[PDB]
Design a protein around this ligand. Structure first.
Ligand code: GNP
Ligand code: MG
Lengths: 157, 161
């Protein structure tokens, strides 16, 4: 199994990769692991503006696409929506299950899951299975159950 | 120009380095390696560095190393100006010219000018006994390919006294 972890810079992708001393990722972080009786290969690719055109270089063979959102970054939700919808029309991601982590739920003005669901236009999606899941990546809160659901869904195929 | 299939059937450690360091026109540079006991969380080994002989490490492990249930191996490397397609590692481990383990890992695309990370979270009593008796006879060859072309060959031996 191959998982691809994307989202805008500063969303907490790398934090997630490490928790389930930290710096902006100018390139990638791979973590490779056994969990639920699967060999998981996970790529955390950087999200600053100029890395994004290189995202497509990790599309091929993806089973599971984790999209990570800074839920307090309300000025950039639409860019985040925009970035996400592109991915979903990309032929090389036709397979993938989509898991949205609505991260930084601890931050006072963290948008709710529902607010994020509306803002990201998740109901439009007709063609990938998905789940939105709040979490605080810094605490470790709500990550595994999120992933666990991802693997079960991928596992049905 | 050596390729993946050329090293997949090797039955012994190579007596020589299989490419010259000039082959490395991608300027792939390993700047950090770290090995962790996943049970106790002890760092077993760490080596850091900024940012045809190639690289060599003589590792100094304990007898307990060989009894561990789970270990984490981290690499960090920076890359030069050119893109790097199909980045790939094959690592083969031998004890007395008898293969022990082979790891074949497909990193994929490397973005020009990047710092990247890869973390991997990964034995008979007569094998353990002989390996503790015979330091530096455990040997490994690490081959790094780029679009099926060998660009880097690192070597290592190991102690478990
Ligand atoms: N308050 C809070 N901060 C978080 C949370 N998750 C991550 N952060 C913070 O967000 C900052 C950037 O996190 P990071 O994981 O590097 O984000 P990234 O998406 O991987 N960055 P890049 O895309 O540049 O690779 C760090 O300061 C980190 O502590 C969270 O749940 N709550
Ligand atoms: Mg990151």
């Amino acid at each position: 199994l191959r998982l691809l972890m994307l989202g805008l810079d500063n969303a907490g992708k790398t934090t997630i990769l490490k928790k389930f001393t930290i710096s902006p990722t100018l390139g990638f972080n791979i973590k490779t692991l056994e969990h639920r009786g699967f060999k998981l290969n996970i790529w955390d690719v950087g999200g600053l503006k100029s890395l994004r055109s290189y995202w497509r270089n990790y599309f091929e063979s993806t089973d599971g696409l984790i999209w990570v959102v800074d839920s307090a970054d309300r000025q950039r939700m639409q860019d985040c929506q925009r970035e996400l919808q592109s991915l979903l029309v990309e032929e090389r991601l036709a397979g993938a299950t989509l898991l949205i982590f609505a991260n930084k739920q601890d931050l006072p003005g963290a948008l709710s899951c529902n607010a994020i669901q509306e803002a990201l236009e998740l109901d439009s999606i007709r063609s990938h299975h998905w789940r939105i899941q709040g979490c605080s990546a810094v605490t470790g809160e709500d990550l595994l159950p999120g992933i666990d659901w991802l693997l079960d869904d991928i596992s049905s195929r | 120009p050596i390729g993946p299939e050329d090293v997949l059937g090797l039955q012994r450690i190579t007596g020589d380095y299989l490419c010259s360091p000039e082959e490395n026109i991608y300027k792939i540079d390993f700047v950090r390696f770290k090995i962790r006991d996943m049970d106790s969380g002890t760092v077993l080994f760490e080596i850091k560095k900024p940012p045809n002989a190639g690289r060599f490490v003589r590792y100094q492990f304990t007898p307990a190393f060989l009894r561990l249930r789970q270990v984490g191996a981290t690499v960090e490397f920076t890359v030069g100006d050119k893109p790097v397609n199909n980045f790939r590692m094959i690592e083969r481990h031998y004890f007395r010219n008898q293969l022990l383990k082979s790891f074949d890992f497909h990193f994929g695309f490397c973005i020009p000018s990047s710092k990247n990370t890869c973390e991997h979270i990964y034995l008979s009593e007569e094998l353990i006994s002989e390996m503790i008796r015979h330091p530096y006879e455990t040997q490994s060859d690490s081959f790094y390919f780029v679009d099926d072309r060998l660009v880097m060959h690192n070597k290592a031996d190991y102690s478990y006294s």
